[PDB]
Design a protein around this nucleic acid. Structure first.
Lengths: 126, 171
RNA sequence: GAAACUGCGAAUGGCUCAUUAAAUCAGUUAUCGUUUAUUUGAUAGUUCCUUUACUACAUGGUAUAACUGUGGUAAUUCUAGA
RNA sequence: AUUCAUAAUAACUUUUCGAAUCGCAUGGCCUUGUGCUGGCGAUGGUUCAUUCAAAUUUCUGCCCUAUCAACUUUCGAUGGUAGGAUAGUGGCCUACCAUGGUUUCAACGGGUAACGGGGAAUAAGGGUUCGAUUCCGGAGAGGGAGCCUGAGAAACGGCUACC
RNA sequence: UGAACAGCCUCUAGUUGAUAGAAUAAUGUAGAUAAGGGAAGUCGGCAAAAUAGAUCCGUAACUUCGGGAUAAGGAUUGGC
RNA sequence: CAGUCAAGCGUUCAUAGCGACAUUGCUUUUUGAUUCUUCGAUGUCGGCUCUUCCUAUCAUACCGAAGCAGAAUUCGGUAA
RNA sequence: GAAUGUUACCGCAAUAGUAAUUGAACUUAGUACGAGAGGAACAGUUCAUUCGGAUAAUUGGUUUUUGCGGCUGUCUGAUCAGGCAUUGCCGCGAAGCUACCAUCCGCUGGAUUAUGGCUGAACGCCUCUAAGUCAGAAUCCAUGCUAGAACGCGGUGAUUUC
RNA sequence: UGUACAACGGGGUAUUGUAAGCAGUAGAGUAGCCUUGUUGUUACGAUCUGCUGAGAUUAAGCCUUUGUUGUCUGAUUUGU
């Protein structure tokens, strides 16, 4: 079995207890009680009716539901390899990064290479 | 019922055909993002805790976030939203869904684990699927490894070896 | 080099003549009363904002798809979950 | 012919544009540095003009009907002021105000086997009739209403609803 | 109050008289309400209900041209 | 209302079913006939309401017969 | 309700009354039967019609709970709170009553008729009949249900003191 | 003279719909104040919001009470 919710009061409708209504547009309403039913037929607004759950929740009364959204104070904690880099050697080369004389000497080599490049290019142009 | 559970760090996933109707009555009347007890559903899941991610009910209509009901509804959905892909730019569309409350109407419930309990799970924790792709961007690789601003991502590159015939290559 | 993201275009064509009797339409004017993608011709020394450390410019951050797989409906160019 | 083009003072902006894009080719200075400079392109990009358009707009012109002579204005009909909206003028809409405006030189209403025109048959001339129909402009996507995307649609071989 | 020496409440003046007390069965008398349907009831819509004031709008046939006509039929109405 | 008889009908055959001409009975729910009671009054049609009774049974229960293949139908019995 | 010796309790059960009724659907079965056309039935199941006897969890109705709130006019200096308005009016409204407008329940054994029969003579056969005898109906009587003879009865308890 | 009874009180359950009183930098606004604000202040002003699912009623034929306060020998008749 199941329990349901009055359209008007928003109340548990234990089985059998209460009425049901089926408008021509196929909207199925349920009513715990003829009180709610009669108000509905009067075309009242539960948000204006005071004892109703809609008014309750629209005026923010009994607000023990929500508390807050949690936040984690840390990082993802994965400086992992990219599946083709061998993380051990990856960290080894990351540590070799400081004391950058290796890359500096490669730059100096390609630098004298650019020197000789302009030189030999001018030579061929001559 | 079925529990399509996932462990996102291991990247693993498995369906579990559940009974113990009352140990899923616990799951009844539950929203998305909420976390209930593995032990409460199953001592095989003792100590674990999941998070109700969502699920498909009968007629395959998924659970959508934010609507706050168990019953099905027809929403005039639009782009940038679950449960509808547009086959044209500008197309809004009316589709039927089920909402963000849990009940017997559901058939498959999609769960994600946030904590690993005391025991181990056969198809989730004992296994771990790898990262199918490596980062294709320079700085993403560089920060993923923690190298420097200048540590030559070009040579820290990923190389994924595959053989066409006997000729093999990393592409 | 499929698929997919993206950008374009899908507002043209084609069909019919139901509507409509100062309305469309035809010739004839104006926009000194307006939009105009696209093409075509020209066109952005001045962007550090307690502007001194507040900030990489041999250059910065974010997914997300496709895909991997779990999959759910009897059915949908149905779609969620990781 | 302008309060035009255009320029400057003073501020406004939740902040607009001012290339983090891509293919080829690789060229030159040496201060011998991956220093500095360099070409042919594609893409996109603020403004102005242009072009294909688009929307409004001036004068003239439409078949039969008086067994239709008064019509329009409640709640826009005519004008004006201010404002809103529009991409833009303007009753397009509102607030307020004057009460006007069309009419036998046939208003208004009805009917149309009426979309209109360029044109077709037919003839000495005059003309009568037809013209949905290959070209031009309009309207529509089963009837209606609405709207997103977009430069451009009130799109329908696109969405929403009702019938 | 309100169109009103209507109806309802009150002031002045006048009355508090009509056998009373206890319970609250039927059947009555007088008053009322009733889901769904709606005159199927009955000689017959008898009785009862519904409508109802005011403002605004709109108004048929027929006509002795005077009327029909509150025609029909619809909208609105408080307080500050 | 029910019987006796059976010329005939029923393809052929009087009787499955009908049964003319003739005839014996029953009932008092008609309508007459009569005028016993009732004219110093038995309240006078119908409907409504409500019970009870008879059966010459419309249906239902069980059965028999048929010109009853089945279905449907007809006749008849115990039965109110 | 007097009277039975008193009073109280438990019972019996004469006699009288009596009630349950009909249909549909699925299945049997598109079977039987029928050349074909068409087209059954018993058992079984679920449901309903009519009638009855209770009950008020649910729903509906009713509302002098004059319980809560509101509304009009008027009176109480105003407010607060109240009176009058033949129960002033409206909305809600429990309890109680109540509804095929709601719900629940509504028994099984014997003797029998008609009819069909068993053996069986008269009538050396034959025959349901004559003696005997079987099954058989919404019938009849019992089971059951209602009241309990107020002049029908039984069992039991306690039966007054200064 | 007691797991006694009764009237009140309490609690619960139900009904209704958020009491009066106070406050408000709420309030259509209209008048007056001046040191003319930036909540300016003052008089009036439906209504709104908070205390308030508050308050009220609740067996009279609802339930329950570790509570309180009381009550508990008046008459008549009866014999195998």
């Amino acid at each position: 079995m199941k329990v349901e919710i009055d359209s008007f009061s928003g109340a548990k409708i234990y089985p059998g207890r209460g009425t049901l209504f089926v408008r021509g547009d196929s909207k199925i309403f349920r009513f715990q009680n003829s009180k709610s039913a009669s108000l509905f037929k009067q075309r009242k607004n539960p948000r204006r009716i005071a004892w109703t759950v809609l008014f309750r929740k629209h005026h923010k009364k009994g607000i023990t539901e929500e508390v807050a959204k949690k936040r984690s104070r840390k990082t993802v904690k994965a400086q992992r390899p990219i599946t083709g880099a061998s993380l051990d050697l990856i960290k080894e080369r990351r540590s070799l990064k400081p004391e950058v004389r290796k890359a500096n000497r490669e730059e100096k080599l390609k630098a004298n290479k650019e020197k000789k490049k302009a030189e030999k290019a001018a030579r061929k142009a001559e | 019922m079925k529990l399509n559970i996932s462990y996102p760090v291991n990247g693993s996933q498995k369906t579990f055909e559940i009974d113990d109707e009352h140990r899923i009555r616990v799951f009844f009347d539950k929203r998305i993002g909420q976390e209930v007890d593995g032990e409460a559903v199953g001592d095989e899941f003792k100590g674990y805790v999941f998070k109700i991610s969502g699920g498909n009910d009968k007629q395959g209509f998924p659970m959508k976030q934010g609507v706050l009901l168990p019953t099905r509804i027809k929403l005039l959905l639009t782009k940038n939203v679950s449960c509808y892909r547009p086959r044209r730019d500008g197309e809004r569309k009316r589709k039927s869904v089920r909402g963000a409350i849990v009940g017997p109407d559901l058939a498959v419930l999609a769960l994600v684990i946030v904590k690993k309990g005391e025991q181990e799970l056969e198809g989730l924790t004992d296994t771990t699927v790898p990262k199918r792709l490596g980062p294709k961007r320079a700085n993403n690789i560089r920060k993923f490894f923690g190298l420097s601003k200048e540590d030559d991502v070009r040579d820290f590159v990923i190389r994924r070896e595959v053989t066409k015939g006997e000729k093999t290559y990393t592409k």
